[PDB]
Amino acid sequence: MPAALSFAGLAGWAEEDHLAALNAFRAGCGVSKDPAAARVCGLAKATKDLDVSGAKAFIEANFRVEAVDGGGDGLLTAYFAPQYEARMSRNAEFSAPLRGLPADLVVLDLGPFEPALVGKKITGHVEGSTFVPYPDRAEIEATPSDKPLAWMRPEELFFLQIQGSGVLVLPDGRRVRAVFAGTNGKPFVGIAIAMRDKGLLADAIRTWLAEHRGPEADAIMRLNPRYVFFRTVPDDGKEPAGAAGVALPPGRAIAVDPGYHAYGGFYWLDAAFPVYRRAVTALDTGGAIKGEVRADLYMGSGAVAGVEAGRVRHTLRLYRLTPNP
Amino acid sequence: LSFAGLAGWAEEDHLAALNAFRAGCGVSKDPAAARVCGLAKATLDVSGAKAFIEANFRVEAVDGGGDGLLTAYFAPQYEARMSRNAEFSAPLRGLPADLVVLDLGPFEPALVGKKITGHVEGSTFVPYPDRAEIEATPSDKPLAWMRPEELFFLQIQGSGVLVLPDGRRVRAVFAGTNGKPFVGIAIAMRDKGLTSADAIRTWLAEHRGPEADAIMRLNPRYVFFRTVPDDGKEPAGAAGVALPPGRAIAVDPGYHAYGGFYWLDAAAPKLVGAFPVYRRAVTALDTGGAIKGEVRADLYMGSGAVAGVEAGRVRHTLRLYRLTPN
């Protein structure tokens, strides 16, 4: 069957928790740049105490259903806000330093040099009488850290670098949030394919790396030259924020390719032994999420979330729920 | 194909042709050419040279005899002085040590092939100063001093010969840029009640000083140079040998070796005021960035303004012949 044009044709719409849908839109709309989305965001936040029937009606009277990519197939996976063990001091197991934004690193705007490049950027640092690209992972991992933010297991740092946010737990129960601070500007390279052609095979990557500290595993993580820097702040127990800078609503937010999807957009997932046909807001991304019909559904931060997220690998048809002009 | 069947070979000035080869051959890495070079350095008049050439080279078409392109070029020539004076008030500046040109590709593959120019300031990198800012920075070690409006034109042309009062000549060779784009001044001048290059040069010369400077400043681009002392009658080409006017070509060195002796048969001019045919023997002694292809020649017309006018009128369909020794 081809893709729907309206809410009537949308399989799952009638059974959707329309309150959760409407709250998902509210969770994310304020981040939106579009002006037609601003009016609707405004009315949504104003209008409270709607029951499920009202919420369903509000959404239907204010949005249009617009298939993405003509209704073509892509992929739904899911992720959760991970909680990692850390130390404030290095040992054999917690051998990788969590590193803050280096003071030498510059994101250089290119517009002052060439109008044709206004709003493009490069990242590097001064070395001698010139300016060079910031070192890659391997070369950063080779200079010791002056003032490391914490110490982690290498494979776990590596994976928190992919997510962009997490919570670290010291043995004394101090919870510290690690918040994305910047990047060395190198492109992300997923290490799974290279691990495949070497014959050593998502949770399995982690487990292999973990069983082979260090130089074995170190050498393969280094195939990803993209290094992510953090800042740390005491966890206030709230949901983490994602790329868009807003508290992620559990089960109701997706990570997207930002080159295809603006943050704050309202979407409908049609994915299919569980089934995901629900409205979500786009509020995050990840170094590996690429493509148009591609969404990574945020499951939450607890234990239940960790378990449900790993179950999701679904054929996805995606739709924008576009606010009416 | 022989010298009898060479359209033009009858009328050719064979003396100059041989002096072209002699100019010339000494730079060749071809044993056969060396043989003939030494042989010609010993041995004349207009009839004796025709004979000498007809007995020592054989004519051979290039690329089967396919059609290519003849253009021409010249060496601009300017007076200069080794000390400033209000006439020769603009310094010819070398490549600053702090100036850097960055390939952007290594930073962001999407920007492969792009470049920016600037210098390190503190812990960042800033755009290089424009013309107006460079001209307002006193010259530490100028390479020479030039009339400003003439430096301005040298900067557009990329290279030229400089002549001092005591007859010493230096070649001014392009060294780099401050990375800003050229901005023409004709229309800014025209919309001011002040249209060709000579006409702009005249005006700028007569209003030399603050007035002229203010409008040259509308062009933010700035070109830097290096100088090589060059005291031949004419300047040296890429082959290291001095170039005989009207008798030397620039070529693609991927196809044609320096010192090679060639015959040009050019016709079908594309421009107004052009000589209808070029038919002559010339030597390969130079190259340039734009001279690409096998049947492709840039004839060197000499230095100075006359050579420059002639050069601009060459655009002809070319059949290229090598005169191979033995």
The two chains with the largest interface, and their residue counts, are: A-B, 22 and 24 residues
Question: What would you call the structural class of chain A?
Answer: alpha+beta
Quaternary organisation: homodimer
Helix segment tally of chain A? 9
Biggest sheet descriptor of chain A: 6 strands, mixed, barrel
The CATH superfamily of the largest domain in chain A is: RlpA-like domain
CATH architecture classification of the largest domain in chain A? Beta Barrel
CA distance, first residue to last residue of chain A = 29 Å
Helix and strand element order of chain A? HHHEEEEEEEHEHEEHHHEEEEEHE
Number of domains of chain A: 2
In percent terms, what proportion of residues of chain A is strand?
A: 25-35%
Please write the CATH class name of the largest domain in chain A: Mainly Beta
Pfam families (chain A): 3D, MltA
EC number (chain A): 4.2.2.n1
GO biological process, one term (chain A): peptidoglycan turnover
Domain Lytic transglycosylase MltA (chain A): 83-231
Describe the structure.
2 copies of one chain form a homodimer. Chain A is globular, with a radius of gyration of 21 Å. In chain A, strands 2-15-12-14-13-16 form a 6-stranded mixed beta barrel. Chain A has 9 helices and 16 strands. The first copy, chain A, has helices spanning 18-29, 36-46, 52-62, 137-140, 154-163, 192-196, 203-211, 215-221, 303-309, and strands at 63-67, 74-79, 83-85, 96-98, 106-109, 121-127, 130-133, 150-152, 165-169, 175-183, 228-234, 253-255, 266-271, 276-284, 294-298, 313-323. Chain A has 2 domains: 1-81 and 237-325, Barwin-like endoglucanases, CATH 2.40.40.10; 82-236, Beta Barrel (Ribosomal Protein L25, Chain P). Chain A binds chain B through residues 104, 106, 108, 110, 112-114, 117, 120-126, 128-131, 133, 185, 187, and chain B through 97-98, 100, 102, 104, 106-111, 114, 116-120, 122-127, 179. Chain A: One of its GO terms (cellular component) is outer membrane.
